[PDB]
Amino acid sequence: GAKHSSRLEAHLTRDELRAKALHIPFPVEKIINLPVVDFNEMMSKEQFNEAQLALIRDIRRRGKNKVAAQNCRKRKLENIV
């Protein structure tokens, strides 16, 4: 395929693809990395639909890898032995 045809829609990766279709200007690369202040600027200065805002939050959240996908000895006994 063409690599220089990554202007619209699929500008970078699959996540970028849906983001661009969702009117997201800033690349997912940035969104994962945007600090709260940049994230505040986003909501403050710019304005999008709910769908679009949801993705920004999502990429941001996944970029902030603090989901605790470690062993994590916790007392969260949902249904485990």
Q: Tell me how far apart the alpha carbons of residues 21 and 69 are, in angstroms, rounded to a whole number.
A: 30
The count of other CB atoms within 10 Å of the CB of residue 26 is 14
How were these coordinates obtained? Answer: NMR
Q: Tell me how far apart the alpha carbons of residues 38 and 33 are, in angstroms, rounded to a whole number.
A: 9
Q: Which pair of tokens denotes residue 54?
A: 């949801």
Q: Tell me how far apart the alpha carbons of residues 30 and 25 are, in angstroms, rounded to a whole number.
A: 10
CA distances (Å), 19 to each of 8, 23, 25, 51, 81, in order? Answer: 10, 6, 8, 10, 40
Which domains are delineated in the chain?
Answer: 1-81 (1.10.880.10)
DSSP string for residues in 10-76: SSSSHHHHHHHHTT--S-HHHHHH--HHHHHHHHHH----HHHHHHHHHHHHHHS--S--S------
**What are the φ and ψ backbone dihedral angles of 31, each rounded to 5 degrees?**
-60, -45
Query: Which residue, 25, 64, 28, 32, is CA-closest to 46?
Result: 25
